[PDB]
Curated annotation (Swiss-Prot), chain A:
Mitochondrial membrane ATP synthase (F(1)F(0) ATP synthase or Complex V) produces ATP from ADP in the presence of a proton gradient across the membrane which is generated by electron transport complexes of the respiratory chain. F-type ATPases consist of two structural domains, F(1) - containing the extramembraneous catalytic core, and F(0) - containing the membrane proton channel, linked together by a central stalk and a peripheral stalk. During catalysis, ATP synthesis in the catalytic domain of F(1) is coupled via a rotary mechanism of the central stalk subunits to proton translocation. Signal peptide: none annotated. CDD domains: F1-ATPase_epsilon. This is ATP synthase subunit epsilon, mitochondrial. The gene is ATP15. One of its GO terms (cellular component) is mitochondrial inner membrane.
From Swiss-Prot, chain C:
It comes from Saccharomyces cerevisiae (strain ATCC 204508 / S288c). Its main location: mitochondrion. Transmembrane segments: none annotated. Keywords: ATP synthesis, CF(1), Hydrogen ion transport, Ion transport, Membrane, Mitochondrion, Mitochondrion inner membrane, Transit peptide, Transport. GO terms for biological process: proton motive force-driven ATP synthesis. It is found in: Mitochondrion; Mitochondrion inner membrane. The chain holds residues 33 to 158 of 160 of the full protein. This is ATP synthase subunit delta, mitochondrial.
UniProtKB/Swiss-Prot annotation, chain D:
The chain holds residues 273 to 392 of 511 of the full protein. GO terms for cellular component: cytosol; mitochondrial inner membrane; mitochondrial intermembrane space; mitochondrion; proton-transporting ATP synthase complex. Its main location: mitochondrion. The gene is ATP2. One of its GO terms (biological process) is proton motive force-driven mitochondrial ATP synthesis. F-type ATPases have 2 components, CF(1) - the catalytic core - and CF(0) - the membrane proton channel. CF(1) has five subunits: alpha(3), beta(3), gamma(1), delta(1), epsilon(1). CF(0) has three main subunits: a, b and c. It comes from Saccharomyces cerevisiae (strain ATCC 204508 / S288c) (Baker's yeast). Belongs to the ATPase alpha/beta chains family. Disulfide bonds: none annotated. It is found in: Mitochondrion; Mitochondrion inner membrane. One of its GO terms (molecular function) is proton-transporting ATPase activity, rotational mechanism. This is ATP synthase subunit beta, mitochondrial. The keyword ATP-binding applies. The modification Phosphoserine is found at S101.
UniProtKB/Swiss-Prot annotation, chain H:
This is ATP synthase subunit alpha, mitochondrial. The record marks S117 as: Required for activity. Belongs to the ATPase alpha/beta chains family. Present with 41500 molecules/cell in log phase SD medium. It comes from Saccharomyces cerevisiae (strain ATCC 204508 / S288c). F-type ATPases have 2 components, CF(1) - the catalytic core - and CF(0) - the membrane proton channel. CF(1) has five subunits: alpha(3), beta(3), gamma(1), delta(1), epsilon(1). CF(0) has three main subunits: a, b and c. It is found in: Mitochondrion inner membrane. Mitochondrial membrane ATP synthase (F(1)F(0) ATP synthase or Complex V) produces ATP from ADP in the presence of a proton gradient across the membrane which is generated by electron transport complexes of the respiratory chain. F-type ATPases consist of two structural domains, F(1) - containing the extramembraneous catalytic core, and F(0) - containing the membrane proton channel, linked together by a central stalk and a peripheral stalk. During catalysis, ATP synthesis in the catalytic domain of F(1) is coupled via a rotary mechanism of the central stalk subunits to proton translocation.
Length: 48, 265, 120, 120, 169, 116, 253, 168, 85, 116
């Protein structure tokens, strides 16, 4: 898997004893979608 | 009536003035956090740039752009749209990944073909490492970013806390990193996958920075716009107030004439 | 000196000795160490600027001694104490998750983090 | 006042309360007299009566009356004829504010709002 | 005007602004009413125009929202897309009447969203052509609509099919 | 709350407040949008829209107006049904499934009707 | 223009300037200027008189007075009488001027009279024959032909718009009669432009070939230019283009 | 009322509604062909109301402190206060209480909008205990009015505290 | 709707679709149309009758008129006597 | 559309509708701006601003008063001139080019003047 995805997962796990502030938790927990497009035609907004 | 239709419409404008005022205050509050983050983020980016500069790394084509899903932040969306469009005259066939519905809509008009990947759910959000990382992971897989030896990113550099100039930067793929002249002063193995990894890591770090610069500019612009909105609404309030006052008098006078006519009989 | 930087925070933007876990095993950098680029593995990091030593649990990043002796460390997030019992409980659950499941790779990374936790 | 001015030479100062109620009183007197109410009800002779009053308030050779009048704006409409006629006589306007008094400033006087033609 | 409004059983508001806006005939349909409603008109035309009123009313609400520069969801844009075509459908040349037999199809087509599909620009072309197509083939249908003044299940289906047949162009 | 009883009053009071909120927020929704108003506000708006068409009820004498069969609802039944709606037990029912309904059964039935 | 913005003063300056024309030897150059003070406090007029005698301009000028104290019939007849004097100069062929401050108060006076004559109030409660009064008064002022001795009696009538309401019956009625108007912007007056002139709500069209040819040549297109300044400052809240910016800079200076 | 007042006693007379007194005088005057006036009410409607409203009194203490509190009620037709009868009465009376429709709907009964209610005599006839513990109340509510202009998000803590205090 | 901005034309449209029934049979569906024109100029009327004659509708239209010149009593009287017809 | 011809009527129709839209959005434009209104509308508005300016035509009797030589434009010329502008053929040059001048040929020339 991609290096920055690897680090991301590690960072998210790392915000776990928990003590953490909301902003830490937010950088490690966000909801979104990615709507792919085409050369037009859009593969639907799938949760990122 | 003139009087009632004026009065209700004037009340609407009054309420609008008040809301745009309210928004301007809330915007200032929101802006402070955005900027604060952006300092730290930008500092972090500079350290990576320290490598790229000293390395003299430098540079189909990718275009990425960042703006929110939401509108009414001023002309952040459309100054950015124009400057993307300027660089879309520079290469029409480049594949645009649009992060933000607003930048998507404007660009979709100039070319809809180039829209290849897009992000919905970033708009309201303040910069977050997780989003940037995930977008990067999808960017690598879906767009095969390295295949395009040119990458270009667009954002709004928040030139002044009343201004925003859309600005762009490249993200250095592993091929570039490989052939940079100083790269021996920096020491790593020829068997290392560090160029392709550093590319990936800075794909997210640069993208996050691009988001931070943009988001701060965006919220700042929104504050500016909402301040000016309160003023514009005010001018119309005054104009219609004079109309209201005149109309109030006019009703009295016209009625009075009727009273006089009646009295005369 | 040392730039130690996170996106929303900066830990230590003349640092004398820094001990780092990198894709090269573990590397220690002391004053002038010739300029390197090494990707930092998820890490437990000790930074000493003078004799004073600060202990960090760091989510990895990238490490670069610059030719001008600016030790650019970029990492996503951290103190050691902040990471630190509930975390041990959660990781047991996460260990269970590895049995089923990108999510497969993710759970494997969580086990790597469990190793990193075990280091503490 | 005129006994003081003319016949004791004295410069005197005559306060009047609401000149809205002066106007209002006049408006009623036209209607009572049956005389056709001039625009916004006011007596057709509104101007002349005020004119006599505020030209007997002036500097004669003997003395001078001076009058500070209190103007209670009619529904805060200064476009109304009665304020305009008053403003014709006025040489200064003193615009006290309670907002200003609420800023602890007694003088209640709102300085920017207050304007005079005697300031020159 | 107030006195007459009370006396009358309907008001048929026409608005000048909507004339300039290019709705000719310019009808302010928001204020155009017949308090009693339909049964004083043809049964067939009553059936077809059943949700025409609802669509237009929804279009009006949706159209208003859009001008405040607030982003539109797909549901509003279904309404918007349907509504726009309908507005263009309403427009008719002065001194051009239309036989009820040839007003029933056009409204059926519109309400059954065949024209909500067809592009705004070429709505005017379609109306003329649609009538020509029915004149060629389903001129029997037009006669039936005139003669029987109701649309049976079979006739409604036939009519649906006719429009469908002319979905090409 | 005693003339027509506490329940009747309270239910109706909730309606009045809810609607007054909806109307005030209607202006905010106009430019800013409903999404720029809180989760609580969004639920209140959603309830208000549902209530708004819950008021809609056809009449027997509008079998010649609208041509839609009338609906008669017992006094007790109306009070009960509005209480239920407010409790949000029927906030799983579409807005248009309150349009031109009668009782609670009808509100449910029109949800089923839309479902099919 | 608006109330006590030194409305009178703008006209006074004209009267003063004509002192190298009113002490100017040529009798064509000599205006005999009449200041009609209607509805004005007798004290303020006495200050004006002192100003005029200070600028020694009184000797070529007449003051006719129908003060606020002075009664409505006197006020009604006040412009008419003054214009007769003006006509005596005019009918000597001699050039003259009459400045009527304020005909708006003459309207109020005729309103008072009409109401007191029980004559029905016209529009805005000002009698329906108010137009007739103004028109008969205004069209006396003239430049006569050389046969008639080239009489002159210039007219500068001073209308006090309350609230700057220029749609008002009396103002519109006057505007249609008069050739050119000189509307004055209060906001600018307050905001340190004295005299404060509306650069398009002041018009004239009869003075342009009666003005000195030097000041026709030099002033060529400047009205247009400052209606480009008007445009520039219209859209400034135009471009950062050097031409527009230059116009803003020129305009400000 | 004068008998009570004269006896030195105090009493409260609630004239409800002077708006209907006004109409009655209008009807009377117009039918007697007595001159109409503003808003087709006779001009001495002011004179009528003022005479009535000045009979309410708190006598000198040598005259035995004969109070006669009054609370006239004016009905606002379309919320109009610019109207001739309201404007006159507001001026004549010292104090006004102005209730607002929104507040009634929002279940705030009393629906009195104390933004538009004032008392001039005020704290002279306020319980001392109640004055002490509601000077604060006036200030809190004053702030609440200003802080009503935040009703969206990202707001000062002070604003949030105010909202809690004010709403409660 | 605002004065004669095809306001007059609205009435003419009715007449035109009613051409189909009028020309057509069914006596009880033949709306012999009665157009009442009050306060309007002779030229306006003259254009109308030509338009109507072109459209062959003055084969079933009745025009009751009270032109702008034609008196105020006659203008008051024009609807009620149109009503009688 | 036949009395003065279909082409004339079509040209006029578009002008009336376009200008009416521009006027309709004047409230919104003023409170906000055009960078807070639709792109589609902004094109229309920009075209309309040109059209608005196009309508200028100093008269020959006003030539003195304006100080600008008179402009008399033939009807046949007029239909052509507006047609082109409506198709935006010559829309790409200053709004001031259209300002205080007559015919299409003149606008083009005044663009050349401005360009210098």
């Amino acid at each position: 898997i991609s290096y920055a995805a690897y680090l991301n997962v590690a960072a998210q796990a790392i915000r776990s004893t928990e003590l953490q502030t909301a902003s830490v938790l937010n950088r490690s927990q966000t909801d979104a979608f990615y709507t792919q497009y085409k050369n037009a035609s859009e593969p639907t907004p799938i949760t990122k | 009536a003139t009087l009632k239709e004026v009065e209700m419409r004037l009340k609407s404008i009054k309420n609008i003035e008040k809301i745009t005022k309210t928004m301007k205050i809330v915007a200032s509050t929101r802006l402070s956090k955005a900027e604060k983050a952006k300092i730290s983020a930008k500092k972090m980016d500079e350290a990576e740039q320290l490598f790229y500069k000293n390395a003299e790394t430098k540079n189909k084509e990718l275009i990425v752009a960042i703006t929110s899903d939401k509108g009414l932040c001023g002309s952040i969306h459309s100054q950015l749209a124009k400057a993307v469009r300027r660089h879309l005259n520079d290469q029409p066939n480049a594949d645009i990944v649009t992060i933000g519905d607003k930048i998507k809509m404007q660009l979709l008009r100039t070319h809809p073909n180039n829209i290849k990947l897009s992000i919905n759910g970033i708009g309201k959000d303040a910069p977050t490492f997780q989003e940037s990382a995930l977008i990067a992971d999808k960017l690598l897989s879906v767009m095969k970013a390295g295949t395009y030896p040119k990458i270009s990113i667009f954002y709004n550099d928040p030139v002044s806390s009343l201004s925003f100039e859309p600005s762009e930067k490249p993200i250095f793929n592993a091929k570039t990193i490989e052939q940079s002249p100083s790269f021996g002063k920096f020491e790593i193995d020829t068997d290392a996958n560090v160029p392709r990894d550093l590319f990936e890591y800075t794909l997210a770090n640069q993208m996050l920075t691009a988001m931070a610069q943009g988001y701060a500019a965006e919220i700042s612009a929104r504050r500016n716009a909402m301040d000016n909105a309160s003023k514009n609404a005010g001018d119309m309030i005054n104009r219609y107030s004079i109309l209201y006052n005149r109309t109030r008098q006019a009703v009295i006078t016209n009625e009075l004439v009727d009273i006089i006519t009646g009295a005369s009989s | 000196k040392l730039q130690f930087a996170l996106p929303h925070e900066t830990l230590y933007s003349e640092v004398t000795q820094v001990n780092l876990p990198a894709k090269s095993g573990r590397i220690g950098v002391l004053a002038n160490h010739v300029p390197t680029v090494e990707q930092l593995l998820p890490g437990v990091v000790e930074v000493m600027e003078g004799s004073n030593s600060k202990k960090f649990f760091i989510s990895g990043g990238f490490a670069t001694v610059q030719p001008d002796s600016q030790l650019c460390v970029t990492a996503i997030e951290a103190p050691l104490e902040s990471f630190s019992e509930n975390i041990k409980n959660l990781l047991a659950e996460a260990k269970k998750n590895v049995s089923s499941s990108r999510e497969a790779a993710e759970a494997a990374i969580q086990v790597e983090v469990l190793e990193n936790l075990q280091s503490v | 006042a005129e006994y003081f001015r003319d016949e004791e030479g004295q410069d005197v100062l005559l306060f009047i309360d609401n000149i809205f109620r002066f106007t209002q009183a006049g408006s009623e007197v036209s209607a009572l007299l049956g005389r056709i109410p001039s625009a916004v009800g006011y007596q057709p002779t509104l101007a002349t009566d005020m004119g006599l009053l505020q030209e007997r308030i002036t500097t004669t050779k003997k003395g001078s009356v001076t009058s500070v009048q209190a103007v209670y704006v009619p529904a805060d409409d200064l476009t109304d004829p009665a304020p305009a006629t008053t403003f014709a006589h006025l040489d200064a306007t003193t615009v006290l504010s309670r907002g200003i008094s609420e800023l602890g400033i007694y003088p209640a006087v709102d300085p920017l709002d207050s304007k005079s033609r005697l300031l020159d | 005007p107030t006195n007459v409004i009370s006396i009358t059983d309907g008001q048929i508001f026409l608005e000048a602004e909507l004339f300039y806006k290019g709705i000719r005939p310019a009808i302010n349909v928001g204020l155009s009413v017949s308090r009693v409603g339909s049964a004083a008109q043809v049964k067939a035309l009553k059936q077809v125009a059943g949700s025409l009123k609802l669509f237009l009313a929804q279009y009006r609400e949706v159209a208003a929202f859009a001008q405040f520069g607030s982003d539109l969801d797909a549901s509003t844009k279904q309404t918007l897309v349907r509504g726009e075509r309908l507005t263009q459908l309403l427009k008719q040349n002065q001194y051009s009447p239309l036989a009820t037999e040839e007003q029933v199809p056009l409204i059926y087509a519109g309400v059954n969203g065949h024209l909500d599909g067809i592009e705004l620009s070429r709505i005017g072309e379609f109306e003329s052509s649609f009538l020509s197509y029915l004149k060629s083939n389903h001129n029997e249908l037009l006669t039936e609509i005139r003669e029987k003044g109701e649309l049976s299940k079979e006739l409604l289906a036939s009519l649906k099919s006719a429009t469908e047949s002319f979905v090409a162009t | 709350a005693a003339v027509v009883g506490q329940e009747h009053y309270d239910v109706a009071s909730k309606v009045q407040e809810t609607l007054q909120t909806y109307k005030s927020l209607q202006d905010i929704i106009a430019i800013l949008g409903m999404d720029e108003l809180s989760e609580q506000d969004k639920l209140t708006v959603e309830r208000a829209r549902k209530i708004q068409r819950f008021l809609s009820q056809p009449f027997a004498v509008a079998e010649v107006f609208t041509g839609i069969p009338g609906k008669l609802v017992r006094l007790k039944d109306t009070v009960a049904s509005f209480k239920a709606v407010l409790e949000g037990k029927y906030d799983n029912i579409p807005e248009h499934a309150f349009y031109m309904v009668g009782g609670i059964e009808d509100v449910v039935a029109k949800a089923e009707k839309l479902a099919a | 223009g608006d109330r006590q913005t030194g409305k009178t003063a703008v006209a006074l300056d004209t009267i003063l300037n004509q002192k190298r024309w009113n002490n100017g030897s040529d009798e064509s150059k000599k205006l005999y200027c009449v200041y009609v003070a209607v509805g004005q406090k007798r004290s303020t007029v006495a200050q004006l008189v002192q100003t005029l005698e200070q600028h020694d301009a009184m000797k070529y000028s007449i003051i006719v007075a129908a003060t606020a104290s002075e009664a409505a019939p006197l006020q009604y007849l006040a412009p008419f009488t003054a214009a007769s004097i003006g006509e005596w100069f005019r009918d000597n062929g001699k050039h003259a001027l009459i400045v009527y401050d304020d005909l708006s108060k003459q309207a109020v006076a005729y309103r008072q009279l009409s109401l007191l004559l029980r004559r029905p109030p016209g529009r805005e409660a000002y009698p329906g024959d108010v137009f007739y009064l103004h028109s008969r008064l205004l069209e006396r002022a003239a430049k006569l032909s050389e046969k008639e001795g080239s009489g002159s009696l210039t007219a500068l009538p001073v209308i006090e718009t309350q609230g700057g309401d220029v749609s008002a019956y009396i103002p519109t009625n006057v505007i249609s009669i008069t050739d050119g108007q000189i509307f004055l912007e209060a906001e600018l007056f307050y905001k340190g432009i004295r005299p404060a002139i509306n650069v398009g709500l002041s018009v004239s069209r009869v003075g342009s070939a009666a003005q000195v040819k030097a000041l026709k040549q030099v002033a060529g297109s400047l009205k247009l230019f400052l209606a480009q300044y008007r445009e520039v400052a219209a859209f400034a809240q135009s471009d950062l283009d050097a031409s527009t910016k230059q116009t803003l800079v020129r305009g400000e200076r």
